[PDB]
Design a protein around this ligand. Sequence first.
Ligand SMILES: [Mg+2]
Ligand SMILES: [Zn+2]
Ligand SMILES: [Zn+2]
Lengths: 171, 84, 58, 229, 51, 519, 97, 168, 107
Amino acid sequence: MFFLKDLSLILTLHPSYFGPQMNQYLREKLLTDVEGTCTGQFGYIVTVLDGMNIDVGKGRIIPGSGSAEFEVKYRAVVWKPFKGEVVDAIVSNVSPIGFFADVGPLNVFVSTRLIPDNLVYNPSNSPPAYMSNDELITKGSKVRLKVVGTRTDVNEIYAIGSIKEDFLGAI
Amino acid sequence: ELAILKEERTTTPYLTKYERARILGTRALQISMNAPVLVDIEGETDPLQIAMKELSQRKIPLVIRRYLPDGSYEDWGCDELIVD
Amino acid sequence: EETVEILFEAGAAAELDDCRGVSENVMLGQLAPMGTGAFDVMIDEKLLTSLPADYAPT
Amino acid sequence: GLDGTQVERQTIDTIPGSDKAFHKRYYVDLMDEKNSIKPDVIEYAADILGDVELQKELNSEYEQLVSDRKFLREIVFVNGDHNWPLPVNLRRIIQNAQQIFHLDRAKASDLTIPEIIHGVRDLCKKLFVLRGENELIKEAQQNATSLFQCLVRARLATRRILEEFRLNRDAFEWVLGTIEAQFQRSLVHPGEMVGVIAAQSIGEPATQMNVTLGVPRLKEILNVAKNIK
Amino acid sequence: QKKAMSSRAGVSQVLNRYTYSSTLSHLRRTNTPIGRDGKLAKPRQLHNTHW
Amino acid sequence: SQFPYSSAPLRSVKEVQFGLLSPEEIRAISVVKIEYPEIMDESRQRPREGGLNDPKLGSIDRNFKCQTCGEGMAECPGHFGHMELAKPVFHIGFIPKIKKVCECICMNCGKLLLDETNPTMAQAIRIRDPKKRFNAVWQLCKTKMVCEADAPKVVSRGGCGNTQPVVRKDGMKLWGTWKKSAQPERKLLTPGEILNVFKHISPEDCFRLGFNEDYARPEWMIITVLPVPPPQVRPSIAMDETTQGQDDLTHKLSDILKANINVQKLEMDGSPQHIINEVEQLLQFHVATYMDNDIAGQPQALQKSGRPVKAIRARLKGKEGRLRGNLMGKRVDFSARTVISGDPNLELDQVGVPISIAKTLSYPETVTQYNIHRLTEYVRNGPNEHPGAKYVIRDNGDRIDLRYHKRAGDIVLQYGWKVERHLMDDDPVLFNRQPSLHKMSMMAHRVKVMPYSTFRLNLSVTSPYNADFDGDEMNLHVPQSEETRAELSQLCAVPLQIVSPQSNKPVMGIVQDTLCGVR
Amino acid sequence: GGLRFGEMERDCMIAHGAAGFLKERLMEASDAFRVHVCGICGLMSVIANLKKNQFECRSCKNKTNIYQLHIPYAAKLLFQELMAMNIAPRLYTERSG
Amino acid sequence: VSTSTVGARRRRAKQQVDDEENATLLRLGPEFALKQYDHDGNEHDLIALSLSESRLLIREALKARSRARNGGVIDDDELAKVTSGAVANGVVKKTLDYLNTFARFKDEETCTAVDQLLHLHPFEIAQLSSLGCEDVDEAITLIPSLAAKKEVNLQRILDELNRLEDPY
Amino acid sequence: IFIYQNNITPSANKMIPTVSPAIIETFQESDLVVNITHHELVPKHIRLSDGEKSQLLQRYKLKESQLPRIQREDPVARYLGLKRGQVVKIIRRSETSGRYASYRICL
DNA sequence: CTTTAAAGCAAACGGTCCACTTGTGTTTGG
DNA sequence: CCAAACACAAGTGGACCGTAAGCTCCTATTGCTTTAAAG
RNA sequence: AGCAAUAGGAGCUU
Ligand SMILES: [Mg+2]
Ligand SMILES: [Zn+2]
Ligand SMILES: [Zn+2]
């Protein structure tokens, strides 16, 4: 789920870059650096509210190196899942051992054992998809799916859900 | 929060010896790191002497943050402190 | 003086060292809040933005 | 508030002497013709005699000098010593001013009494050891520079400036401006490690040194002893 | 050997052969093992009986 | 920049928080349990895992890496192990404070003998300083010889009513005299019983005596598991090209392990009560002298050479210990020393530097667009001709030694690179004579390169140094950066020290022949 | 070998107010080192694998709050000996109170 | 690297079992304290954003930064482009399309109305604006914490919500 | 103020502080024979008021513990009836500046 | 019958701090 | 108002820790001996 | 592209 997060990023600037439009160069550096990164403690940083109007303040020269440090404080929006929270999605992949659903920036895959047993897979249908009597899961469908697991890998994270519970699955 | 407004700044208006020494060292390191030079470079190649010329012409772009014993501080640009 | 006894007493009482002294900053190899290290040097923006636009980062 | 390299021994001239010598050096009289300024030193000599709106300022100056005399004699230096280390050396300032502006030929001086008095008053209100509009700041600032103001007023007295040193207006402005700047240069810098400097300044003389004296006595003092030799 | 502490040190020294007089002096040297732990300047003093 | 890139941000230490290490955290930060005494496996090539040279503890070899962090000898800090003790033992550096807490508290129910009811202690609690509070509570609470169950209708404070012992110290054994009611039965207080009593102290009780709930818990002053330092702290050495003896700490840890195993050979079989005490006391003594081998009134843990063991405390104290011998002062690179000579023809702030020293010492000069021709001339000149250069540092830290490089003509200097050129004329160097009694005994001079291996000084500066030319030697320190060059030239320079603050008079004058000649 | 920059040399540099020169003598002209500390426990118990870019304080079960510090190697050795005598010196990079 | 107002969290001797997450039981982690702070350290109420406020904020920020880039001079598949980097564009495009596929409140007017009506724990406050529910049952079973508060009002609040819900 | 002759025994002395809200101080007659504030080495002490103490602390951006201190048992604090937290102002001779004002806080 | 490896075994004078001894005072209870 | 025993106050003996700075060279020692086991 | 430690003794300049 998306949270508005106050966060900072300390930076280092070479003396060669010490020109008259420096602060805007650092703003562009921040926008390139942070727009897309994952952190295990926050989630996923999709955008930044009021990107061009971040205040870099006054940087301090590090004694011995001559490079500037900036505590660029700003308020942004981050998206983090939590186990036991219900999140909607749309299926991306399909496979006999389960399917993938894109959640926020990520993609969630649900395993075969965690699926209502009235759902039956089909490798021969056109289009290929899970079926049932009165239940359908095809590409482009919506899935109100619960998260029951999230491993934190620094670059890309993955969440494994479960549609075995009531009020969940095809919608 | 801890910064002091430019009106109630009660420190000396004069650059001290330690501030001058450290400012010159830092500027010399900066110019020696291929930083742009604000003064007109005529003859000298030593980064420290270039830094001295810039300091005399009030063209060194640095700020001294003078910490008080209670943790608060005052900010003075080098160009507004008076150099002897 | 009394280095080991003082360190033991500091351990046994959970002393917090504020690292404002000279010797303490010396043994950690840091800049002492002394002489040239009694202040900080920031980067001024108001004076910098007067430079020619061609001396800029690319 | 001064850096310890910046002070030099100077005589405080209001301290020594008899009251008659004090009176003759410093007291001026406008109505009284003889005890006034010698006429042959100033342009405006004839305009001086008989005035009152100027004898008031002269009396205020003389009373300030008597206040300094009493203060130094009764509170600070009760035993009469008047040669003390102080900031900017004024003898050297005066002699440099004489050299630069060529004070020979005993020329008519264009330096009026009210301008002298107001110049010295403004100077005495321009020696900043502490800056701030607070009230304890003002009290500490005036306590800081009381002795140096006593020196500057004992030296730059109207009779002395006009007769003994014969400064004109240009030399006067130069002396005042130089006193401002050199006093501002005599101040200790924030960040000074006065403790290490003091420790070395005390310990080094110990390397060259029935009352107990020298190293054992200094050891008694520093190793605070419940009984001494 | 196992009681090197609490034993007198420097009782034997390498004979100084830098020059002849240095050898002659080293062969006639004397040492009072008072030790430097103690600032009593009295035993360091040239005394009348030294004549 | 000579450190390989790490992604964490670099910051400096603002606060140091001392405290004890709990057994839980000692076990937690460890990487391998240590139980086997014997150093090598069986004299058999990469010794026994779980011994004192486990590769998990870290690498001390140049061509081997740490099996815990996978880093070279340069970067690996070393890693701690742990070695569980069969019985708990006192920390040697806390026995007096263990005694004082034993005297203060109730040794049966773990409660302060007096409460806030008594106003003297009710105000002794009110000291903010832990040490003053502890002193003010111990000096009152030490004399009440019972844990009264009623605060002075019957209202119970929860106390017990057991009498208090008169604690005494005899070596490492804490005796406590119970004067019942005649014959006061004096019994030995073992570290384990005191540990059990100490675990019962409540957090607020703990606060009153002046300890801490998170950092210093009174039972952590009793050792139950012992950290094993990495081999970096106790490296081996080589005596004649094939032989090695372990450091004192290593043999001490081996002796402790032997003692531990002997303890574990008594509670498993017959032990007629005059061997359990002996062996447990052997463990106590080995552990004590592993930390402090200067304990009053007992023999010292000795080496088979007859010397005493170099304990950690002895490692830390004295002129030659860690603090004063390696932290307050230390040996430094880029320094020189030789006899000084006088030169009437030098300026006051000039020092004459021998050619050989001028070529041995060096200054790193960043390549820029104002000094590139001069630096390339220095690179071509080489490290055997003056003015030349000794090293070229690439923008990533790779050194190009110009001695062994046969093709010195084929080096082009890049911008931002660094050349460690020779010592040259007008370089500011710090110049110093011992003893340095005042700030003017060590001053910065401008260099002038000269033959004839002495240092040259103008004769008026020999007074602040207290130097003359009858054998004296003086030290020269070369600043290795621009900040230090500027600091030297703008604060320590000879012209700036002519007037001293000691007596607000000059210290340099005209001396020793110019004075006679001018007269 | 090198020359000893003893305590009185440090006193003279302190009197001169040359802080940068003193730091440079004692660090870059001598045993400068780099260590990693735990942002939670402040002990140098951080297991660092720089080529795999992975850090962990296993006591605190921490992999994200870890900081590096440049300190004298003699200071690191001092802290390790203190840890060997059960004393915990905790190096914290920010003030609390 | 990426840090926030959450600072020391220093090590007390004791641990806490109450550190695992369970979004059913109001356990979120030591980053979303019941009383947040701002970039000036001043105290400030926790923020738990529904899909509507967040969508409006992101659209606003993107169009503001586009007008800033343009010197002062319409679709999520285009509006997400303002970021830098292909991964950035992809993540913001997926997020924006997700917002426009489940945004029952497609305007600032109804977002303001629900803000007024709602202002109770901000978690469930936002989840009501995010999870359509017919009657009391879905709310009290999918969100099990509404039981032990004795201020429900779900019936009429949800009625007015689904009433204000625009067609699709 | 309870002026006594010979000794005040510690048993009696303990009742002195427990008699709030009144204040009891004691002096021995032998100590009072000479007034020590008239001594040349003893400069004039003037206890500050609460408002002036606050002004002093704010002017120097100070905490109470960062001031030079004076014991409540100091002969001039005892002579002045100083209670804990009260600050005296001490004007004294200064050979470098003429006049110097010192402030001490009571333990 | 000889060699190697591992384990065990000897005989200077000053001063801050801590509480046991020596001493004085209370205030219950008749 | 006065007798008393134990609550409460110092005086006193004898424990530890430290003793300028920097530098040079040379020289010796780095565990040893006895018993037991294996080839 | 890699030159042990600990001790004692004698010295140098203050
Ligand atoms: Mg000499
Ligand atoms: Zn009890
Ligand atoms: Zn940790």
